[PDB]
Symmetry: D2
Subunit: 215 residues, 4 copies
């Protein structure tokens, strides 16, 4: 089935210090929307919550004329895994690996996220990020089981200068993607994120829209 | 004025061998369309004409709310320059610098293009490129006179594998871009390109559309 | 103390397929030499064993004037972690995280290594790598607990063309590095690797030498 | 012949503003040493003179066992050209193309250098660079007429933080390099630079040493 609900377990470390968080949410797989709440297990994170945005569910993304490959792989249970790198302009790096299991229309995510090299005086460790800019991701299918996706990402900051990164990932499928997917390349995805947080929890929302054209 | 016609002069070298091209064309600055016919002046090209696509006029690009910064800088004569790098997956590199002069609605381009490190058995030197994929460019304005634009570009080939590149550029303006430009970031631009070529000449078309959103 | 023996548990996945290996060896921490042997647990590896070379112990590396920061962090038990990315020329990516424990002069490594996007017909998945070229890594210390290390790496192949990658890592220390280490930047490290393998096992050797100058 | 003297002409622009500089120097092609003096011809330099270091003569570099390919190509008159890109960590970029002519043991260089995207408050435009760090360049020979060279470069600054860049170039030869050069890869080159400057002139010195090994 298409998803209705999801849970998240995100674990790993930033600058060598372990973190762990759990959250739960819902979404609309016909519209590419999702929302998630996460209560901190033991006080605020030691870094900007905004750095978590890409790690806070492509199963909610439909494609223009049917299921996305993500949806198809959830629907038949065969699945996919995500392997992502993010290189930040101040020399920090994040690597991430997402695994999923499904229980009918419920998704369970197990996301390992490792970040290093964030300067102690930089905008991540001193909580100066204010929002993530809207993004366009480019997707290509080098083979029938593999998506390569790239985006140039940026956050606004309290200082007014943007904090930029390069995001690259593979999405690796256990079963080939369908011909209706592979025949249309590149596929782009527009994404909007919203995050609010307090000292004790965060709320996250994302809107995603796949497109081959705007003209 | 907004542009209606243009001429092209590309000069430089690929793998150490000089080339030169001249062309002329037209475009619609209200629709982001352009068309060019061109000829090689030092005999037949030693490399795939498709490599020239990005070098074959953002003055034809309107913005959603008004003139693009490119149009504004042509209209008041203050101008901009383009400084572009392209890094190809097989280790080749192109650097380019575009200068323009304006005569009413006519644009004169002087574009220096230098390419090196194209493998002699690669898809550029052996004419295996078949089309340029549609693209999305992301633009940010790190300061009021500078655009940073990035795109992940790809060509289809006869070998069935794409030929990928990273394109990056600064666009440097003599006068600040207007507030109605600076206020809207990121700005994306969708581009479609068509190229036909023979041993002596080519015909090129491009369609460009700026967007802040697709939702 | 300085290390004399080590073992390795390396695990993760390549192109979505899990692997797990254990190896053991020895090294000379006054000379920067080490050796490791490993049997394939459950049949041959599904990818070139040469891709494992950087993942197959800087505690064996002395510095030009005394202990390396790696050796100092082992001596006092405070330790360090390694977080590494490798980007290959054909679009594949590897991410890795190394954690260590110490029992006297014995090192235990737990290394998670995840690779994706290796083309099925490329040199890794078809076992065309023949050796790893000698390398120079550049090290800088952006802060007193963090090393940033970069190298441009290359393998020879059976086709007589090299297979290139960009390697980047942070080494994150629990305690600050000593002032005498921090004072000498950049620090370079020359490395030579040797690997032999059959269908059932591999044998690895590495020599490493730190240097600030060659003149 | 081997070179003994040289002249420099650098032309191009930084952040859209034209610059032009000429200088004269000497060197020792048996030792990999050179020195150059340049007086400022049209007023004070509008950016850190340290940014010019890589642009301020590989014909002075011998190889370990004989003439370098640069020296061979000068000596037989066939020559080489340099095509270089430098990407700086704050988003600035420099592209460069070096052409040479020879008059006996005298080199004449014509170097086009274009830089863009240097932040007006960054260390280049506010003269905070204090020295270029010693460097290691890695050279490979993808074909018998082409060198690909890479280096991770860094300057010290008055802020204490290093200013890093990625330098990449091709060196393209009119005639094949000697067979006795081509199988010894990678070839590394260690470089030390010194720059003295006043309001009216600069004096530059470089030492270069090729090496395949340090053990």
């Amino acid at each position: 089935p298409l998803p209705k609900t999801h849970e998240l377990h995100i674990f790993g470390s930033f600058n060598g210090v372990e973190f762990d968080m759990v959250g739960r949410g819902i979404g609309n797989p016909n519209e590419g929307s999702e929302e998630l709440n996460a209560k901190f297990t033991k006080g605020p994170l030691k870094f900007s919550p905004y750095i978590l945005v890409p790690h806070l569910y492509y199963q909610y993304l439909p494609f223009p004329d049917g299921m996305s490959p993500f949806q198809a792989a959830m629907h038949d249970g065969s699945g996919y895994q995500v392997h992502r790198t993010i290189q930040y302009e101040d020399g920090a790096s994040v690597t991430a690996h997402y695994r999923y299991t499904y229980e009918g229309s419920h998704i369970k995510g197990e996301f390992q996220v490792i970040g290093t090299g964030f300067p102690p005086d930089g905008p991540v460790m001193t909580n100066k990020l204010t929002a993530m800019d809207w993004s366009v991701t480019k997707m290509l299918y080098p083979n029938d089981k593999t998506i390569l996706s790239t985006a140039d990402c940026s956050y606004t900051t309290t200082a007014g200068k943007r904090y930029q990164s390069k995001m690259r990932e593979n999405n690796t499928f256990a079963k080939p993607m369908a011909a209706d997917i592979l025949q249309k390349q590149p596929m782009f995805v527009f994404r909007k994120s919203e995050l609010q947080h307090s000292k004790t929890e965060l709320t996250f929302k994302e809107w995603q829209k796949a497109f081959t054209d705007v003209m």
